[PDB]
Amino acid sequence: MREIVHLQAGQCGNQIGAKFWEVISDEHGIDPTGTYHGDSDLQLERINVYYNEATGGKYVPRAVLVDLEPGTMDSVRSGPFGQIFRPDNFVFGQSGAGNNWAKGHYTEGAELVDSVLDVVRKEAESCDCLQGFQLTHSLGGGTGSGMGTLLISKIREEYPDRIMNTFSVVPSPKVSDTVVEPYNATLSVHQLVENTDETYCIDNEALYDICFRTLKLTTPTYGDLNHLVSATMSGVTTCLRFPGQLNADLRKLAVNMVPFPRLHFFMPGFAPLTSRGSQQYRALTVPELTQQMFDAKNMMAACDPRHGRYLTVAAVFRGRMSMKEVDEQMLNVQNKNSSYFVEWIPNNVKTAVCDIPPRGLKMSATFIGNSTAIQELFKRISEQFTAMFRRKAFLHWYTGEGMDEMEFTEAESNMNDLVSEYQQYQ
Amino acid sequence: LLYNWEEERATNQLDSESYFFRHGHQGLLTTQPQSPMSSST
Amino acid sequence: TYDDHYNRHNYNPGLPALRTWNGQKLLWLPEKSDFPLVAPPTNYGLLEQLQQKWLATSLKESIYTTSYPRLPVCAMSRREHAIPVPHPRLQPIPRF
Amino acid sequence: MRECISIHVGQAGVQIGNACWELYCLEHGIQPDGQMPDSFNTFFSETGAGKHVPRAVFVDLEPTVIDEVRTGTYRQLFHPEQLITGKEDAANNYARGHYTIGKEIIDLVLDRIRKLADQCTGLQGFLVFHSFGGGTGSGFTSLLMERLSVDYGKKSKLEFSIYPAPQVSTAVVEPYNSILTTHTTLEHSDCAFMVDNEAIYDICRRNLDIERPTYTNLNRLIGQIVSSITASLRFDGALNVDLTEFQTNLVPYPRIHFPLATYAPVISAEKAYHEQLSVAEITNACFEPANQMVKCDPRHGKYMACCLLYRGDVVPKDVNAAIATIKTKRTIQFVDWCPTGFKVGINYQPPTVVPGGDLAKVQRAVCMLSNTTAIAEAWARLDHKFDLMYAKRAFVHWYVGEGMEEGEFSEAREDMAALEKDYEEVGVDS
């Protein structure tokens, strides 16, 4: 009834969505051979949001999976979840992008969007009523930031009514993995503000913290940092997919949170995190969840929230609950630390309630928030850029593939005037 | 009992190391297999 | 050197794993000290070919006898793809 | 379907390609016959009876080392026409290399390249292996970068070339032909890696304890840097590289494209089990000046762009906690136009040892293909030697007598004027 079209690009994306598409297989009781073997009946109610129907009771997703090289979607088919993802929905190229923007935005990822847009416009008109979009993609790479920003650009040109959301993998500001991060991440956030409404910035430096000091694992992979990112994705739509006390959809937190066309850069979170060995000493109640997600060490981008004032703060909940006790907890976190909000909005907190907790939990919550201390996620990239523009550090790659320097010069006049709006209110 | 004594000893009984756990580990869930089929609305 | 290091696969009677560090001279010799010399030299089959060319009743032979002998009885072609003749082919058996 | 055709040329290229194409036999299930008893398709092609035949071109003008490949058991794997043989050499000269003898075996190479790339559906670049200081690789390769940059055009090209040794040198006329092959490579290439012959004799004496090593004791060591550079197409892993990931993350400028190689874990068989190979020490090996494969100190100059191609147990966490202390120290210097600096690539396969090798079975290998402005010192000692014998016009008469003039002498010095002018202006801070 309100389906979700999912987009993927890069190899950074397609390890995350491969982990996103298994908690949906967990919560809807989907086995890795396409059928359904869950013991409930409410899990089969709104199955249609992520599972198109076929013969034999098979449920296969609304998934788009794209890269410019064949070397990544070989492994996605070769994962634990091979039979579920659609064979016609592996759009592939031949040459890797190789950490460059115009390799995907103007030349090699640009010739291939006419086969992706064939897949989407056929699929998105098979939905009876789509709610909108979502993307998990690399700003760090050459395919997600190069090709995928065209798909944010060109699909929004088709339907301007729906909602664009982004599980952005923004680079860390401290330790960098590529010498052209202040170009591919600088130029990508030039087109995000005219085009995209929800922007969830994710850092791996912020997430190497959490799987050590909170989950207590000495040997973390990506696949156990991908699951917390894959926790918060299905942790957003908890109320559209299930009944409960107060349902909310993805237009209901894009109205409560973003008072302006250009102040819409969120800050993600997840509530109930405790060690694997010490799981049964805590009491999983209402004061335990709220005391964690209102802190800096439970935050999925690498900026300290204490250096600014939140404009607006969202939430969502799940599980059987007593709504007055949350209502006592939301005023306390508006009455005690009143210096960590601006004074020119009356109400800053929203809540919404599901009914069925996840398989193995009892009380769940997910933290989504606008904050004006996300400037330090962008000023570090914006000060890395002009320390190499002035030395013209890599411009021969970019000029020799169909760009200018006037497409470079205006991509920090956007990035400066973005921060030149957030600065006044904090 | 070196650094990180208790948890690394405890987790093995409940649960090529990187190659086996490359897909992940069951971090954010209980050890019990099923808590579905709750007709609890 | 090609034949010793590559094709030969190296020395055989020497120490396969052990490299023992000796007393007086300060050295890990028992791999380096051998400088392998095992077995026969590099033979690869050229004296054979030139020997059949070197050493030799067909002096009196017409080429039609030598170049056209009787072939063996088993090298004859099997006709796998041929229209079967058990059912007689379409032929104008009306003689008109 | 992501193949790579790689070019070895010269007396070195058959000496290296005997010891470079021996891992690709060994780490797949590939016999030196050619049989197997699908990651191999980047270097091995199916035939209708199971036989795998490679996709590389090995050229030398003198047939005196190519026929050694034809003698041993490396013959049925290779293809009979895929190895090009002349009758005479070029004899340490660039005039014989580039004009006379280079003009008749050049149209037998390009039959096979044009048949190789017309069966490669996923070729991404070229990889070159030539000698600066010989007769063939100085000249026959110099014709090819003139000739392949007009046919196939805008494709990537990289070379791991054998730089002249700094203090010792073997053949005397080399500070002519080393300078003379340089005006023909700075505008017809993209990434010029250098290795040295003397600078690995130091490595096998201080890390390994083997005194008096052979070329084939130095051919397998450089032959494992190659298998850590193709280590992204070849296997699976977290973050993967390709031939356009290399120079887009390594070369900044049009005319400064000279990086430097370093391979981390070098140790014997017996001493490995008495020592702990943590990821801290493996990334703290390539930042010592006693591990570089040229004889230069990075303490004089300034780094500009680095790389890291891990294998095996990368565990990205403790790698990230190991680069984070390299960024701390003031001994390691950088230039302010590159505040990011690094690259990380990952592969899952730990490296493989050959039978009768000199390294052990290591589970974590690091190559570090970085550029520095301290190669500009190393060019000068190879450029000081030029006018020390042009002033007397010492060996010049071998050059006019095979087509060249003395104007190629007059400008190849002047090209080194503005190349080393450029490195002083990139090494200055803002």
A277–B contact, CB cutoff 8 A: yes
D245 has catalytic annotation: yes
The tokens 């700094």 sit on which residue? D166
Cβ-based neighbours of D430, under 8 Å, separated by 6 or more: A387, A390, A391, D336, D337
Q: What is the dihedral of CA D405, D410, D413, D414, to 10 degrees?
A: -130
Distances (CA, A) of D385 to A43, D165, D195, D347: 80, 13, 20, 43
Instruction: Report which residue type is found at C21.
Output: W
* Domains of chain A, start order: 3-257 (3.40.50.1440), 265-374 (3.30.1330.20), 375-425 (1.10.287.600)
Query: CA angle, A76 as apex, A72 and A77 as ends, to 5°?
Result: 115
Which two three-digit tokens encode residue D383? 């450029």
d(CA A340, CA C90): 100
d(CA A374, CA A284): 31
Tell me which residue of D379, D369, D378, D9 sits closest to D182, measured CA to CA: D379
Cβ count within 10 A of residue B33: 9
Which two three-digit tokens encode residue D333? 């210097």
The CA R_g of chain B, rounded to the nearest whole Å, is 15
d(CA D210, CA D198): 15
Dihedral sign for Cα atoms in the order D71, D75, D78, D79? positive
First to last CA, chain A: 41
d(CA D427, CA D335): 7
CB neighbour burial string for A195-233, b if at least 16 within 10 angstroms, e if fewer:
ebbbbbbbbbbbbbbbbeeebbbebbbbbbbbbbbbbbb
Which two three-digit tokens encode residue D304? 């500009």
From chain C, pick out residues whose CB is under 8 angstroms from the CB of D68: 2
Sort residue D164 into left (φ over 0), alpha (ψ -120 to 50) or beta: beta
D402 is in an annotated binding site: no
Three-state DSSP at D59 gives strand
> Do B28 and A228 make contact, defined as CB atoms within 8 angstroms?
yes
Distances (CA, A) of D105 to A150, D22, D57, D116: 48, 26, 13, 17
Three-state DSSP at A1 gives coil
Which two three-digit tokens encode residue A177? 């993995």
Which of A75, A99, A392 lies nearest to residue D249, judging by beta carbons?
Answer: A99
The tokens 């199971």 sit on which residue? D50
Nearest CA in chain A to B22: A223
Cβ count within 10 A of residue A258: 20
**Catalytic one among D22, D27, D198, D245?**
D245
Tell me which residue of D358, D357, D356 sits closest to D208, measured CA to CA: D358
Distances (CA, A) of A99 to A398, D242, D427: 11, 10, 24
Say if CB D335 and CB D426 are below 8 A apart: yes
d(CA A125, CA A116): 14
d(CA A366, CA A319): 12
d(CA B24, CA D342): 27
Which two three-digit tokens encode residue D167? 């203090």
Cβ-based neighbours of D310, under 8 Å, separated by 6 or more: D319, D344, D345, D346, D347, D364, D365, D366
Experimental technique of record: cryo-EM
For strand A65-66 and strand A90-91, is the pairing parallel, antiparallel, or unpaired?
A: parallel
> Do D337 and A391 make contact, defined as CB atoms within 8 angstroms?
yes
Q: What is the dihedral of CA D286, D288, D290, D293, to 10 degrees?
A: 40
d(CA D336, CA D318): 26
Q: Closest approach of chain B CAs to the CA of D222, in angstroms?
A: 28
Most B CBs within 10 Å, among A224, A225, A247, A363, to test the B interface: A224
Cβ count within 10 A of residue C40: 5
D313–A contact, CB cutoff 8 A: no
d(CA D316, CA D115): 42
Residues in chain A: 426
Three-state DSSP at A137 gives strand
> Do B19 and D348 make contact, defined as CB atoms within 8 angstroms?
yes
Q: How many CB pairs under 8 A join B and D?
A: 3
* Domains of chain D, start order: 2-259 (3.40.50.1440), 260-374 (3.30.1330.20), 375-429 (1.10.287.600)
Query: CA angle, D282 as apex, D279 and D284 as ends, to 5°?
Result: 105
Which two three-digit tokens encode residue D142? 């110099």
Say if CB A156 and CB A187 are below 8 A apart: no
Which two three-digit tokens encode residue D83? 């190895």
d(CA D72, CA D25): 15
Say if CB D240 and CB A11 are below 8 A apart: yes
Say if CB D391 and CB D409 are below 8 A apart: no
Distances (CA, A) of D9 to D5, D59, D231: 13, 5, 22
For A365, the enclosing helix (H) or strand (E) is strand A364-365
Nearest CA in chain D to B17: D313
DSSP C52: H
Instruction: Report which residue type is found at A360.
Output: G
- Selected residues 242-261 of chain D with any CB under 8 Å from a CB in chain A: 242, 244-246, 248-249, 252-254
The CA R_g of chain C, rounded to the nearest whole Å, is 33
Q: Is D27 exposed, middle or buried (0-12, 13-18, 19+ CB in 10 A)?
A: middle
Query: CA angle, A220 as apex, A217 and A225 as ends, to 5°?
Result: 110
Three-state DSSP at A30 gives strand
D42 is in an annotated binding site: no
Tell me which residue of D41, D181, D179, D17 sits closest to D98, measured CA to CA: D181
The CA R_g of chain A, rounded to the nearest whole Å, is 21
The tokens 């847009």 sit on which residue? A117
From chain A, pick out residues whose CB is under 8 angstroms from the CB of D2: 69-71, 94
Query: Concatenated DSSP letters for A172-210?
Result: PSSS-S-TTHHHHHHHHTTSSTTT-SEEEEE-HHHHHHH
Most D CBs within 10 Å, among C1, C2, C18, to test the D interface: C2
Tell me which residue of A189, A145, A135, A180 sits closest to A16, measured CA to CA: A135
C/B Cβ contact: 3+ pairs below 8 Å = no
Distances (CA, A) of A421 to A20, A113, A306, A372: 34, 34, 19, 9
Query: CA angle, A120 as apex, A115 and A126 as ends, to 5°?
Result: 135
Chain centroid to Cα D259, Å, comes to 10
Distances (CA, A) of D176 to A244, D139, D310: 83, 12, 38
Q: What is the largest CA-CA distance in chain C?
A: 114
Query: CA angle, A317 as apex, A314 and A319 as ends, to 5°?
Result: 180
D305 is in an annotated binding site: no
For strand A130-138 and strand A3-8, is the pairing parallel, antiparallel, or unpaired?
A: parallel
D274–C contact, CB cutoff 8 A: no
Dihedral sign for Cα atoms in the order C52, C53, C56, C58? positive
- Selected residues 376-415 of chain A with any CB under 8 Å from a CB in chain D: 384, 387-388, 390-394, 396-397
d(CA D19, CA D356): 13
A215–B contact, CB cutoff 8 A: yes
Instruction: Report which residue type is found at C66.
Output: T
The tokens 């051979």 sit on which residue? A33
Give me the helices (H) in D249-315, please.
279-283
d(CA A393, CA D391): 39
Which of A40, A211, A221 lies nearest to residue B21, judging by beta carbons?
Answer: A221
Instruction: Report which residue type is found at D173.
Output: V
What does residue C75 show for φ and ψ, rounded to 5 degrees? -85, 5
From chain A, pick out residues whose CB is under 8 angstroms from the CB of B38: 40, 356
DSSP D101: G
Say if CB A266 and CB A163 are below 8 A apart: no
D/A Cβ contact: 3+ pairs below 8 Å = yes
- Selected residues 21-60 of chain C with any CB under 8 Å from a CB in chain D: 27-28, 32, 42, 44
Cβ-based neighbours of C78, under 8 Å, separated by 6 or more: none
Cβ-based neighbours of D282, under 8 Å, separated by 6 or more: D264, D265, D364, D365, D366
Tell me which residue of A207, A202, A229, A203 sits closest to A217, measured CA to CA: A207
d(CA D373, CA D413): 20
Cβ-based neighbours of D182, under 8 Å, separated by 6 or more: D412, D415, D416, D419
Tell me which residue of A191, A192, A176, A98 sits closest to A388, measured CA to CA: A176
d(CA D430, CA D428): 7
Say if CB A153 and CB A9 are below 8 A apart: no
Q: Closest approach of chain B CAs to the CA of D237, in angstroms?
A: 10
Say if CB A52 and CB A126 are below 8 A apart: yes
D324–A contact, CB cutoff 8 A: yes
From chain B, pick out residues whose CB is under 8 angstroms from the CB of D348: 19
Secondary structure, 3-state, D110-144: HHHHHHHCCCCCCCCEEEEECECCCCHHHHHHHHH
Cβ count within 10 A of residue C20: 11
Three-state DSSP at D210 gives coil
Sort residue D356 into left (φ over 0), alpha (ψ -120 to 50) or beta: left
Three-state DSSP at D416 gives helix
Tell me which residue of D120, D159, D155, D126 sits closest to D42, measured CA to CA: D120
Q: After which residues is chain A broken (C to N over 2.5 A)?
A: none
> Do B23 and A218 make contact, defined as CB atoms within 8 angstroms?
no
Cβ count within 10 A of residue C46: 9
Q: Closest approach of chain D CAs to the CA of A142, in angstroms?
A: 10
B30–A contact, CB cutoff 8 A: yes
Three-state DSSP at D263 gives strand
What does residue D316 show for φ and ψ, rounded to 5 degrees? -50, -30
Say if CB D123 and CB D244 are below 8 A apart: no
Distances (CA, A) of C67 to C59, C63, D131: 14, 5, 52
Chain centroid to Cα D413, Å, comes to 25
The tokens 């490949």 sit on which residue? D69
d(CA A120, CA A157): 14
Cβ count within 10 A of residue A161: 7
Tell me which residue of D232, D220, D261, D211 sits closest to D353, measured CA to CA: D220
Query: Concatenated DSSP letters for D324-375?
Result: HHHTT-SSS-B-TT-SS----B--SPPP-PPTT-SS---S---B--EEETTH
Cβ count within 10 A of residue D255: 15
From chain B, pick out residues whose CB is under 8 angstroms from the CB of A45: none
Q: Is D402 exposed, middle or buried (0-12, 13-18, 19+ CB in 10 A)?
A: middle
Say if CB A53 and CB A28 are below 8 A apart: no
d(CA D399, CA D386): 15
> Do D242 and A75 make contact, defined as CB atoms within 8 angstroms?
no
Three-state DSSP at D183 gives coil
Which two three-digit tokens encode residue D384? 């000081």
Say if CB A150 and CB A110 are below 8 A apart: yes
For A22, the enclosing helix (H) or strand (E) is helix A10-27
Say if CB D110 and CB D117 are below 8 A apart: no
From chain C, pick out residues whose CB is under 8 angstroms from the CB of D22: 6
Three-state DSSP at A303 gives coil
B6–A contact, CB cutoff 8 A: yes
D269–C contact, CB cutoff 8 A: yes
d(CA D17, CA A152): 47
Cβ count within 10 A of residue A419: 15
Instruction: Report which residue type is found at D351.
Output: P
Q: After which residues is chain C broken (C to N over 2.5 A)?
A: 56
Dihedral sign for Cα atoms in the order D230, D232, D236, D238? positive
Which two three-digit tokens encode residue A220? 């973390």
Tell me which residue of A18, A50, A26 sits closest to A356, measured CA to CA: A26
Nearest CA in chain D to B21: D315
D243 is in an annotated binding site: yes
Dihedral sign for Cα atoms in the order D230, D234, D240, D241? positive
Which two three-digit tokens encode residue D89? 């050499």
Instruction: Report which residue type is found at A390.
Output: R
Query: CA angle, A178 as apex, A173 and A181 as ends, to 5°?
Result: 55
Distances (CA, A) of D22 to D220, D292, D364: 9, 24, 21
Most D CBs within 10 Å, among C6, C26, C29, C42, to test the D interface: C6
Cβ-based neighbours of A205, under 8 Å, separated by 6 or more: A172, A173, A174, A175, A302, D320
Say if CB A375 and CB A421 are below 8 A apart: no
Cβ count within 10 A of residue C9: 11
DSSP A45: T
d(CA A5, CA A158): 14
